[PDB]
Every structure is written in structure tokens, then in C-alpha cells.
Design a protein around this motif. Structure first.
Motif, short mmCIF file in Angstrom:
data_model
loop_
_atom_site.label_atom_id
_atom_site.label_comp_id
_atom_site.label_asym_id
_atom_site.label_seq_id
_atom_site.Cartn_x
_atom_site.Cartn_y
_atom_site.Cartn_z
N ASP A 7 2.94 -4.06 -15.35
CA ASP A 7 3.73 -3.98 -14.14
C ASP A 7 3.73 -2.55 -13.64
O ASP A 7 4.41 -2.20 -12.68
CB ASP A 7 5.17 -4.48 -14.42
CG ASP A 7 6.08 -4.47 -13.20
OD1 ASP A 7 5.94 -5.37 -12.34
OD2 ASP A 7 6.93 -3.57 -13.09
N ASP A 10 1.73 -1.58 -8.94
CA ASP A 10 2.09 -2.55 -7.92
C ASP A 10 0.90 -2.72 -7.01
O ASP A 10 0.24 -1.72 -6.67
CB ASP A 10 3.31 -2.11 -7.11
CG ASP A 10 3.71 -3.15 -6.06
OD1 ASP A 10 3.12 -3.17 -4.95
OD2 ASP A 10 4.60 -3.95 -6.31
N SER A 14 1.46 1.07 -5.05
CA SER A 14 1.25 1.75 -6.31
C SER A 14 2.04 3.07 -6.30
O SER A 14 1.72 4.00 -5.54
CB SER A 14 -0.24 1.99 -6.52
OG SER A 14 -0.97 0.76 -6.41
N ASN A 16 4.43 4.10 -4.78
CA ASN A 16 5.10 3.94 -3.45
C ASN A 16 5.90 5.19 -3.07
O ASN A 16 5.93 5.60 -1.91
CB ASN A 16 5.98 2.66 -3.39
CG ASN A 16 6.45 2.19 -1.97
OD1 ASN A 16 6.61 0.99 -1.75
ND2 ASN A 16 6.68 3.09 -1.04
#
Length: 44
Positions: A7, A10, A14, A16
């Protein structure tokens, strides 16, 4: 390399927060465009 990233990565954002650059920039620079010109041009 994925496999055990699980996880961590993302798909669309990624980290973010690293993209805070464009979060702020796109947000702010595109409002400049709008503000300047749409206050002179009648909406369009």
C-alpha cells in the motif's frame, strides 16, 4: 520495484504530498489566469 510495496504506492497519488508543488502551483497559477483575464473579458 513492487511486490512488497503493498500500500506504499498509491496508483494515482504516489506520496501525493510530494506533488504539493503542483497541488499549490496548478491551483494558484490557474486562478491567476482566471482572475486577471476574466475580470477584463466578459466571462469568456
Amino acid at each position: 520495484g513492487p511486490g512488497s510495496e503493498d500500500d506504499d504506492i498509491d496508483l494515482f497519488g504516489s506520496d501525493n504530498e510530494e506533488e504539493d508543488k503542483e497541488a499549490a502551483q496548478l491551483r494558484e497559477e490557474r486562478l491567476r489566469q482566471y482572475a486577471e483575464k476574466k475580470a477584463k473579458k466578459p466571462a469568456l
